[PDB]
């Protein structure tokens, strides 16, 4: 009820969407509302809020998160590029010697 | 699967009243409720 | 989301998904490109020697 109270008076940007996701959490019964609740909690925990109830919410969720942070850390190589820019100077040292 | 076979006549758990009573509109079927 | 009821929902669906994730993993070669950028430096080592 209070969810609805604050719904519609909220900016159509992010806040409407987090309150919205909170609605997607609260649902009654039937397979549809259960699966919409599933992806609901899914994005809640993936976005760092839900603080899982942890029945299946590690394998299907926490592990997916850890996978996406691993995707967020390729970047040793991006930090490599700037060294090749750096040691082309050492090719200028090859010119020196 | 969480669903028990329960093969016998008249068996159940006494923990069945966890549901609380409430009422709503007149709906023609569960398909039509969720719809 | 669906968590299939799985009568035909593997062959027509799950397998299509696996196909598109396989399409999501060509990228060993994209990770190759940055090494060619890396070992052009080893051509600068060719200049060294």
Swiss-Prot record, chain A:
Signal peptide: none annotated. Belongs to the p22likevirus portal protein family. Homododecamer. Interacts with the terminase large subunit; this interaction allows the packaging of viral DNA. Interacts (via C-terminus) with the head-to-tail adapter protein gp4; this interaction participates in the head completion. Interacts with the scaffolding protein; this interaction initiates procapsid assembly, thereby ensuring incorporation of only one portal ring per capsid. Interacts with the capsid protein. It is found in: Virion. This is Portal protein. The chain holds residues 533 to 629 of 725 of the full protein. It comes from the Viruses. Forms the portal vertex of the capsid. This portal plays critical roles in head assembly, genome packaging, neck/tail attachment, and genome ejection. Procapsid assembly may initiate with a nucleation complex composed of portal and scaffolding proteins. The portal protein multimerizes as a single ring-shaped homododecamer arranged around a central channel. Switches upon genome packaging from an asymmetrical conformation in the procapsid (PC-portal) to a symmetrical ring in the mature capsid (MV-portal). This change of conformation may serve as a signal for headful packaging.
């Amino acid at each position: 009820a209070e969810i609805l109270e604050l719904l519609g008076k909220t900016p159509q940007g992010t806040p409407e969407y987090q309150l919205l996701l909170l609605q997607y959490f609260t649902l009654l019964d039937g397979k549809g509302v259960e699966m919409m609740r599933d992806y609901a909690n899914k994005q809640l925990i993936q976005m760092g809020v839900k603080k899982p109830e942890t029945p299946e919410e590690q394998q299907w969720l926490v592990e997916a998160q850890q996978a996406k942070q691993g995707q967020q850390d390729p970047a040793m190589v991006q930090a490599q590029g700037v060294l090749l820019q750096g040691q082309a100077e050492l090719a200028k040292a090859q010119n020196q010697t | 699967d969480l669903a028990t076979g329960e093969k016998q006549v008249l068996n159940d758990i006494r923990g069945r009243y966890e549901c609380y009573t409430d009422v709503g509109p007149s709906f023609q079927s569960m398909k039509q409720q969720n719809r």
